[PDB]
Write a protein that binds this ligand. Sequence first.
Ligand code: HEM
Ligand SMILES: O=C(O)c1ccc(-c2ccco2)cc1
Ligand SMILES: [Cl-]
Ligand SMILES: [Mg+2]
Length: 393
Amino acid sequence: TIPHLAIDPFSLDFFDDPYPDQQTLRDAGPVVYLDKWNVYGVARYAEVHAVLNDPTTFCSSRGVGLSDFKKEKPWRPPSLILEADPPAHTRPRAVLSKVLSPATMKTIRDGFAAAADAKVDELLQRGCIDAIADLAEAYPLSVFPDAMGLKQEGREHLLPYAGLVFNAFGPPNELRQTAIERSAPHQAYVNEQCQRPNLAPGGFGACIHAFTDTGEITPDEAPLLVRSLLSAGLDTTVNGIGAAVYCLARFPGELQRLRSDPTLARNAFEEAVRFESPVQTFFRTTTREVELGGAVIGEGEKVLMFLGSANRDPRRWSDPDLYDITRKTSGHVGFGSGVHMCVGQLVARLEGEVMLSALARKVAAIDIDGPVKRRFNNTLRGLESLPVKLTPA
Ligand code: HEM
Ligand SMILES: O=C(O)c1ccc(-c2ccco2)cc1
Ligand SMILES: [Cl-]
Ligand SMILES: [Mg+2]
């Protein structure tokens, strides 16, 4: 009844161009079985959305990677938020929601916007730049560590640590095993910065520690919650901003619409998140036997969700393979859906918006002018190098 496929969604060929295989996965049925890894897969919007929105049946506390925490030891202590189910999830989630709240965005927006305008001005002096190292990486590095309250020294550990975290959700392939082999110095740095004395006053880390006297979290939970933001809040935004620049470089008509109405910047970024989906895949584990899209899945089974595929499913989206900055994007699953839906989404959207607003106001053209190179990770999609010429407005 359930079709069995040999597609390896963690292979380099798949990362190089996942879109044909994603259609094959959607069109094979609502639920497939991936023989390479002994997991169920869901690639259509409907089932991805259903799984995300039933956290009781499709839990997170057995891990959101391939590894089942009931069978193997987690590679690092479990996250108190991502790898927790309700009710243990609820109070840590509420703390991070308040630390990254609608109200908190008002304290950082002026500085984030000024940094984005300054970066675009600097890049325009050079003309030909690498939109990954020089923009997608450089901009979030220029704002997010400081907003966290991290010291300057050792920040070179942050992107390697995040790449490790996202590789470690995958299967025990070479990408994952090499990442873990190299991990000790990055883990050591990250764990140390999570302690209260190492986080500058007023930043996100200090604010998490301040919540430890409200009864929502205890002091010994705060370092792991700081760890969550250092894991999840940098490399994702690098790949989101890189995706947006790549979309504007490939679709110049949409750059022209964005220049003509810079208030489209926030939706242009949201559409890039749908179109490229920085976070491509991750897992749940069933807590009982369950019927999903007509298939029966037993207890204790890993279920792989294809978020990028859900975001391109023609059953849900008109012209899914077009980048359209005025699309009604509400309902895309690039930030997840339901109780775990990205708690950092307002930070991500703020960074993306202000960078795209700077480009909309300052840049007339974005032309790819060198070899584009992809960066490979078990669950993140993005580029290693994106040579572009920026022409000033
Ligand atoms: C474009 C950028 C981003 C993308 C595409 C993204 C994507 C996601 C997704 C898909 C999830 C849901 C995971 C799940 O359901 O298991 C998530 C959760 C989360 N994200 Fe993001 N994210 C981004 C930026 C950020 C930022 C800037 C931060 C923090 C400052 C952050 C922190 C978190 C945390 C802590 C969680 C766990 C939430 C929970 O389990 O309740 N993310 N993100
Ligand atoms: O709590 C953490 O350490 C954490 C939180 C979220 C993520 C993530 C996976 C997919 C999207 O976001 C990774 C790590
Ligand atoms: Cl760690
Ligand atoms: Mg069984």
